[PDB]
Amino acid sequence: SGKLTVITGPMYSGKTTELLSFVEIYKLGKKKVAVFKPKTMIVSHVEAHVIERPEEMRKYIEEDTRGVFIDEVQFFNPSLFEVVKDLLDRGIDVFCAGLDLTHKQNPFETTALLLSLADTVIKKKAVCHRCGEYNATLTLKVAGGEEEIDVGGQEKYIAVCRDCYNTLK
Amino acid sequence: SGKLTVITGPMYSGKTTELLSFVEIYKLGKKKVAVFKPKSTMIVSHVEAHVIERPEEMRKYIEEDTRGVFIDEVQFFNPSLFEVVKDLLDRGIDVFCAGLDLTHKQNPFETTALLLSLADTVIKKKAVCHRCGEYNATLTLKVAGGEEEIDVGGQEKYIAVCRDCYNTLK
Amino acid sequence: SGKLTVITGPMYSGKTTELLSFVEIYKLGKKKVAVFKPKTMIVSHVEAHVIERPEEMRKYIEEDTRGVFIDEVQFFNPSLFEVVKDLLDRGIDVFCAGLDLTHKQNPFETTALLLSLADTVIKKKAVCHRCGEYNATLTLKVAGGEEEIDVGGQEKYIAVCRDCYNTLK
Amino acid sequence: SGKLTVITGPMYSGKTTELLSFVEIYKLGKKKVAVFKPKSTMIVSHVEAHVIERPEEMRKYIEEDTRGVFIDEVQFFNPSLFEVVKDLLDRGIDVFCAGLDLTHKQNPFETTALLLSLADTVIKKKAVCHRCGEYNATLTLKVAGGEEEIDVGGQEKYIAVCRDCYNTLK
Numbered sequence A, C: 001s002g003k004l005t006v007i008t009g010p011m012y013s014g015k016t017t018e019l020l021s022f023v024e025i026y027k028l029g030k031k032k033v034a035v036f037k038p039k040t041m042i043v044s045h046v047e048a049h050v051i052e053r054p055e056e057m058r059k060y061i062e063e064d065t066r067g068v069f070i071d072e073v074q075f076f077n078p079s080l081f082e083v084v085k086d087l088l089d090r091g092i093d094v095f096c097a098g099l100d101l102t103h104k105q106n107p108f109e110t111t112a113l114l115l116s117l118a119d120t121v122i123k124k125k126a127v128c129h130r131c132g133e134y135n136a137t138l139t140l141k142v143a144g145g146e147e148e149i150d151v152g153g154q155e156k157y158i159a160v161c162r163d164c165y166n167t168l169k
Numbered sequence B, D: 001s002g003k004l005t006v007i008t009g010p011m012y013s014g015k016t017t018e019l020l021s022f023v024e025i026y027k028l029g030k031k032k033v034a035v036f037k038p039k040s041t042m043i044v045s046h047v048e049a050h051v052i053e054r055p056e057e058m059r060k061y062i063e064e065d066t067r068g069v070f071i072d073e074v075q076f077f078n079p080s081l082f083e084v085v086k087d088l089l090d091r092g093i094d095v096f097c098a099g100l101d102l103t104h105k106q107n108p109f110e111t112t113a114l115l116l117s118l119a120d121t122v123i124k125k126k127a128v129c130h131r132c133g134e135y136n137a138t139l140t141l142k143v144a145g146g147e148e149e150i151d152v153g154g155q156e157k158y159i160a161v162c163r164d165c166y167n168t169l170k
């Protein structure tokens, strides 16, 4: 059967970098891959199919696809759980990267569902913006409104450890 | 801050055994622990626990010098457990939670899913597949009783299987 | 091919307990195992063949042996490296537990050689006898002479973290 | 105390890439680092380093506020590296070492073996097997040049293989 590996953690924790490392491993082994991002390059702080609904993946999966790679999974509809389950049942390995928690420390539900299904969970850490320790597990929003769905980078979000998050809040 | 470690996997994967290992570690270090299970008193694998109905009941048993909180069968607790645990971590208390990730129908257990999202560390445990004997079982399959997803029981009702064996047997 | 897993760390770090957990996994799967200790029970703080030389293992390995489990590997002749390599080549998984360092912080050479060969290395920690933190990586000798080969338990050896070791020395 | 992390595996397993990742982590935290390679200056994967012949030469480049020491290609350093590293750990400096565990003939590299024994954490990396394409290569096989076990080189001389493929090709 296919195995599901979920790579999660706060922003800047190396989730996309790890995901791309896995893509490279499959490519080096001459295994066909399909790479997806929500609505073209997967960029760290490769080319992907940009899709809206998880079900669109099926358009781009071939008989000999061995691995499916999905970035920013927190932005996908939770139906991604059942789509992934079906890929695993068909012998296709799946690798997902995404945020575990919003900047308000609420779960991203799609990520949470995938963590449930995962054969392996890799929790990544970032360097804390405040204290410089390699212990950041949260993201804090420093600009924009309070919205939990709000695309952005270092102008809007910083990685912090739990103590620094509580101090700053 | 406290760290949250979530130990998950199918039945018979050693989740409770691992949880009790960490209890032992804290006890050897003369660190105060609080141990909980959902509503008898014995946390026993295939230690004494406070048997509680609701996550909000944990506060009564958490003293000022509690260093670790240990919770088994977390799939059966109300999802309010998420904010309770977050508060403990903010106060510097380490939390260890053991529970099933998936029902026998491969639906997520909500509370476990939420705690996986808050976790600093996730330990996915495997079991031996009842069918092929490999150490690759990640799922539980229900072999007796009804189709119900909430149904307490052991070997008389559930086996651990790998994905391929689960699909084959279904 | 067989895979080699080495479980190492100071005394009281759970190495035998982990080794026995692996034995149980193979037994539950109805896979034949062969279990060895140096010169009858493997006891944590199962029955084993007590042997002197690593080459004696071959007397007790059968065509359908799937796993070989060796405790206290630090006490075996370094020829255990080549014996293990041959088992792996034959498709037999090998699990070794043993101390990485003496109480003088010198390497146990047999363990070191096996760490080199290992597919997976599990470093176990103990609770520090002095500070109570789960950070003990060393063993300190508190009775007996200075000998590095000296069988014993808690009457002779304690597990300590590096800072506590240096403080106590 | 400082902790020692040893990153090992066959060629092309990402050892240097992982080592440089940890360098980056310390640099982002504004922690002083010292980076070494055996005797040009660039540590480059398949950052600037001090190129040194002997482990005893590291002391010159370690300042009072050095937080991390990073060492690549440790298999080529004298086994005296063991006591040098032990001393750094005793002084509170974290050490990260990357190196091969085994020669192409499957003999242990002595210095790597000693550091594996001192390590707090061992990361075994794999490569893609040149023969079967699976992510299961743990060995290096020499495909050109002589039988020598000390022979600097890359893809023109060495491939990564799994155990079964190594045995088959031999």
Ligand SMILES: Nc1ncnc2c1ncn2[C@@H]1O[C@H](COP(=O)(O)OP(=O)(O)NP(=O)(O)O)[C@@H](O)[C@H]1O
Pocket: A010, A011, A012, A013, A014, A015, A016, A017, A018, A043, A044, A045, A099, A125, A126, A127, A128, A129, A136, A159, D024, D028
């Ligand atoms: N606070 C930080 N900690 C660690 N690395 C950082 C930090 N800020 C920037 N970086 C850089 O970010 C890289 C990781 O980038 P990447 O793999 O894109 O992370 P990510 O987890 O995908 N982030 P995101 O997509 O925003 O949720 C690191 O290798 C660093 O170069």
Ligand SMILES: Nc1ncnc2c1ncn2[C@@H]1O[C@H](COP(=O)(O)OP(=O)(O)NP(=O)(O)O)[C@@H](O)[C@H]1O
Pocket: B024, B028, C010, C011, C012, C013, C014, C015, C016, C017, C018, C043, C044, C045, C099, C125, C126, C127, C128, C129, C136, C159
């Ligand atoms: N300092 C300590 N830290 C952790 N556990 C300890 C300590 N002292 C005693 N124990 C107990 O020891 C058990 C681990 O025993 P075991 O699996 O035999 O360890 P080991 O690493 O094999 N020791 P050794 O064979 O002496 O090299 C733990 O589960 C505890 O019950």
Ligand SMILES: Nc1ncnc2c1ncn2[C@@H]1O[C@H](COP(=O)(O)OP(=O)(O)O)[C@@H](O)[C@H]1O
Pocket: B010, B011, B012, B013, B014, B015, B016, B017, B018, B044, B045, B046, B126, B127, B128, B129, B130, B160, C024, C028
């Ligand atoms: N299929 C199986 N795989 C592994 N262990 C099993 C299996 N069936 C029974 N066991 C026994 O169950 C123990 C694990 O029990 P436990 O820690 O209570 O697991 P969990 O809390 O995950 O159900 C094992 O050590 C073993 O003795």
Ligand SMILES: Nc1ncnc2c1ncn2[C@@H]1O[C@H](COP(=O)(O)OP(=O)(O)O)[C@@H](O)[C@H]1O
Pocket: A024, A028, D010, D011, D012, D013, D014, D015, D016, D017, D018, D044, D045, D046, D126, D127, D128, D129, D130, D160
């Ligand atoms: N057989 C292989 N397996 C994996 N990666 C390989 C292989 N051959 C070449 N590469 C490339 O080598 C990179 C790893 O290089 P590097 O970090 O310098 O490894 P090491 O220091 O272990 O030799 C991979 O990311 C990949 O780009």
Ligand SMILES: Cc1cn([C@H]2C[C@H](O)[C@@H](COP(=O)(O)O)O2)c(=O)[nH]c1=O
Pocket: B010, B011, B012, B013, B015, B016, B099, B100, B102, B103, B104, B105, B140, B141, B148, B149, B150, B151, B152, B153, B154, B158
């Ligand atoms: C798989 C599964 C288990 N259970 C119960 C059976 C056990 O009482 C408990 C799991 O025990 P365990 O994870 O310690 O082995 O959960 C359900 O109620 N529904 C399910 O779908």
Ligand SMILES: Cc1cn([C@H]2C[C@H](O)[C@@H](COP(=O)(O)O)O2)c(=O)[nH]c1=O
Pocket: D010, D011, D012, D013, D015, D016, D099, D100, D102, D103, D104, D105, D140, D141, D148, D149, D150, D151, D152, D153, D154, D158
């Ligand atoms: C496998 C092997 C590599 N080497 C050299 C080749 C490379 O120069 C270096 C390993 O590089 P790497 O581990 O960064 O890929 O070691 C030997 O000298 N002897 C050997 O047996």
Ligand SMILES: Cc1cn([C@H]2C[C@H](O)[C@@H](CO)O2)c(=O)[nH]c1=O
Pocket: A011, A099, A101, A102, A103, A104, A139, A147, A148, A149, A150, A151, A152, A153, A157
């Ligand atoms: C932390 C956080 C990030 N994001 C976005 C910012 C980035 O575009 C992406 C993480 O790479 O997710 C949110 O939309 N909500 C959040 O709460």
Ligand SMILES: Cc1cn([C@H]2C[C@H](O)[C@@H](CO)O2)c(=O)[nH]c1=O
Pocket: C011, C099, C101, C102, C103, C104, C139, C147, C148, C149, C150, C151, C152, C153, C157
């Ligand atoms: C730490 C240490 C333990 N031992 C012995 C004590 C125990 O009998 C065994 C570890 O379980 O190894 C030594 O012989 N030398 C040492 O340096």
Ligand SMILES: [Mg+2]
Pocket: A015, A016, A017, A043, A044
């Ligand atoms: Mg990203």
Ligand SMILES: [Mg+2]
Pocket: B015, B016, B017, B045, B046
């Ligand atoms: Mg249990």
Ligand SMILES: [Mg+2]
Pocket: C015, C016, C017, C043, C044
């Ligand atoms: Mg032992």
Ligand SMILES: [Mg+2]
Pocket: D015, D016, D017, D045, D046
């Ligand atoms: Mg390299």
Ligand SMILES: [Zn+2]
Pocket: A128, A129, A130, A131, A132, A133, A160, A161, A162, A163, A164
């Ligand atoms: Zn911080």
Ligand SMILES: [Zn+2]
Pocket: B129, B130, B131, B132, B133, B134, B161, B162, B163, B164, B165
């Ligand atoms: Zn099976």
Ligand SMILES: [Zn+2]
Pocket: C128, C129, C130, C131, C132, C133, C160, C161, C162, C163, C164
């Ligand atoms: Zn200590």
Ligand SMILES: [Zn+2]
Pocket: D129, D130, D131, D132, D133, D134, D161, D162, D163, D164, D165
């Ligand atoms: Zn191969």
